[PDB]
Amino acid sequence: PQITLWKRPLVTIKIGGQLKEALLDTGADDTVLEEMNLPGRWKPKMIGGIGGFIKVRQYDQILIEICGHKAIGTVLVGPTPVNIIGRNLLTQIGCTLNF
Amino acid sequence: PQITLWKRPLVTIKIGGQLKEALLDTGADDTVLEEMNLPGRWKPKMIGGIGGFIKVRQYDQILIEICGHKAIGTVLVGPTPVNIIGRNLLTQIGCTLNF
Ligand SMILES: CC(C)[C@H](NC(=O)[C@H](C)NC(=O)OCc1ccccc1)C(=O)N[C@@H](Cc1ccccc1)[C@@H](O)[C@H](O)[C@@H](Cc1ccccc1)NC(=O)[C@@H](NC(=O)[C@H](C)NC(=O)OCc1ccccc1)C(C)C
Ligand SMILES: O=C(O)Cc1cc2ccccc2s1
Domains of chain B: 1-99 (2.40.70.10)
Sheet hosting strand B2-3, strand order edge to edge: A2-3, B96-98, A96-98, B2-3
A5/B89 Cα distance (integer angstroms)? 10
Residue of B57, B75, B76, B77 to test ligand 2 pocket, by largest number of atoms within 8 Å of CB: B57
Q: Cα dist. B76→A18, A38, B45 in Å?
A: 37, 38, 8
B29 is catalytic: no
Residue B82, ligand 1, Cβ within 6 A: yes
In 10 A of CB A74, how many CB atoms? Answer: 16
Resolution in angstroms, to 1 decimal, for this deposition? Answer: 1.8
Cβ distance of A97 and B96 shorter than 8 Å? yes
Q: Please give the single-letter amino acid code of residue B78.
A: G
B21, exposed or middle or buried, with CB in 10 Å at 0-12, 13-18, 19+?
Answer: exposed
Query: Relative to the alpha carbon of A25, which ligand is closest?
Result: 1
Containing B31, the helix (H) or strand (E) segment is: none
A31: left (phi over 0), alpha (psi -120 to 50) or beta: beta
| HSE of B66, CA atoms in CB hemisphere, 13 A | 28
B74/B63 Cα distance (integer angstroms)? 9
Specify the pairing of strand B84-85 against strand B96-98: unpaired
B25/B10 Cα distance (integer angstroms)? 9
Cβ distance of A97 and B95 shorter than 8 Å? yes
Cβ distance of A69 and B99 shorter than 8 Å? yes
Q: Cα dist. B91→A42, A43, A80, B26, B71 in Å?
A: 38, 38, 24, 10, 9
Q: Which of B93, B83, B78 is nearest to B15 (CA)?
A: B83
B72/A18 Cα distance (integer angstroms)? 41
Question: Ligand 2 center to residue B56 CA distance, Å?
Answer: 6
Size of interface A-B (CB pairs under 8 A): 130
B49/B64 Cα distance (integer angstroms)? 23
Residue A32, ligand 1, Cβ within 6 A: yes
A38/A62 Cα distance (integer angstroms)? 8
